[PDB]
Design a protein around this ligand. Structure first.
Ligand SMILES: CN1C(=O)C[C@@](C)(c2cccc(NC(=O)c3ccc(OCC(F)(F)F)cn3)c2)N=C1N
Length: 365
């Protein structure tokens, strides 16, 4: 029933796309961040002054404790929760109960932030990232097993410049347009893909392709901006600045906004990805509309930021496409998305193929 998995995500103007879930018996309703960058299902298990609601295990007759807690740390934020299992329903999609592992948070720091509307997280990446270990089966793996659905999910995020769709168990034709292009997953932990080349206003950066996979290049719906390793971030900033000619130093680091559209003053940025046939590639392109972001005449943020360790294709880039996480065939797909528009104007482009003769056979160090 793919057509009832349409418009099941709310985007609350850029603070994460979240899905509504009924958890336990009788059902408690949560709002859950959809995150392709982690692998735990974790929800608030006690009151917190920044959330409206939490999951109370004592009010569920089908909840079973698993007899250990788990501590998770991120670069920013951390939490400890009890591990247990309970029944889950997704009203917009899966109105049949499946039993999943769940972490109920009773201690945290800089995790529930003021104004945020989600009170848990749905981690959709591979078991290898699961905490405390890969043997804690992930939500999607439980769904695949119990529902006999294919091992594929996909995502349309429609909030460029208000929500979108998570399709569990497949692909929805009305959500994309034209051809799907697939790039292999290189490692099944994150959705790690192989980036071959960055191009600014039609000119490629002068950097070894291994810089782009410096550690890892990943597709992560739980990250806001396009994130780039420092070296790559600094080269991109120079290439953008020179190709537009308008800037205070603080615009590039996110410490100032620029107030004025400006979009015609900035260049396209293209990411080249290896195609499932290794001898070609395809590119995804974002227009200034996605990375020069109106915040409220208007005032604008640079939608790219530095990372210590990863190139992260985050939610702002994903708003430019229909994205297919084809676990079964070990690939990620990208297609043009009808809803990737600001007042009818396109925000993004996708094209291919291109030869990969000018580039190393393996760009992943
Ligand atoms: C990066 N990352 C982490 O650092 C750990 C973890 C669990 C995490 C933890 C806490 C919050 C978040 N993410 C978010 O709050 C968030 C907020 C807005 C987001 O999208 C904004 C927009 F949709 F692009 F506009 C995406 N994620 C992610 N997931 C991640 N993917």
């Amino acid at each position: 029933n793919f057509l009832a998995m349409v418009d099941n995500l709310q985007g609350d103007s850029g603070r994460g796309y979240y899905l509504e879930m009924l958890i336990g018996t009788p059902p408690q309703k949560l709002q859950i961040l959809v995150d392709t960058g982690s692998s735990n299902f974790a929800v608030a298990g006690t009151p917190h002054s920044y959330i409206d609601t939490y999951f109370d295990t004592e009010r569920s007759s089908t909840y079973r404790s698993k007899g250990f807690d788990v501590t998770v740390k991120y670069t920013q934020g951390s939490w400890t929760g009890f591990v247990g299992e309970d029944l889950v329903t997704i009203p917009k999609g899966f109105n049949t109960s499946f039993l999943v592992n769940i972490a109920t948070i009773f201690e945290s720091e800089n995790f529930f932030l003021p104004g945020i509307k989600w009170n848990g997280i749905l981690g959709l990446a591979y078991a290898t990232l699961a905490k405390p270990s890969s043997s804690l089966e992930t939500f999607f793996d439980s769904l695949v097993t119990q529902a006999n659905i294919p091992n594929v999910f996909s995502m349309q995020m429609c909030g460029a410049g208000n929500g979108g769709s998570l399709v569990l168990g497949g692909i929805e034709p009305s959500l994309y347009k034209g051809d799907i292009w697939y790039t292999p997953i290189k490692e099944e932990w994150y959705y790690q893909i192989e980036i071959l080349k960055l191009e600014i206003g039609g000119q490629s950066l002068n950097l070894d392709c291994r810089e782009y996979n410096a550690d890892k290049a990943i597709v992560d719906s739980g990250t806001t901006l396009l994130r780039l390793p420092q070296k790559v971030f600094d080269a991109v900033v120079e290439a953008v600045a020179r190709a537009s000619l308008i800037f205070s130093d603080g615009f590039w680091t996110g410490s100032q906004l620029a107030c004025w559209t400006p979009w015609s003053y900035f260049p396209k940025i293209s990411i080249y990805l290896r195609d499932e046939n290794s001898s070609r590639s395809f590119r995804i392109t974002i227009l200034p509309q996605l990375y020069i972001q109106p915040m409220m005449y208007e005032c604008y943020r640079f939608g790219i930021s530095p990372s210590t360790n990863a190139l992260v294709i985050g939610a702002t880039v994903m708003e430019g496409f229909y994205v297919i996480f084809d676990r079964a065939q070990k690939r990620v797909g990208f297609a043009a998305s009808p809803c990737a528009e600001i007042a009818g104007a396109a925000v993004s482009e996708i094209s291919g193929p291109f030869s990969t003769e000018d580039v190393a056979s393996n760009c992943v160090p």
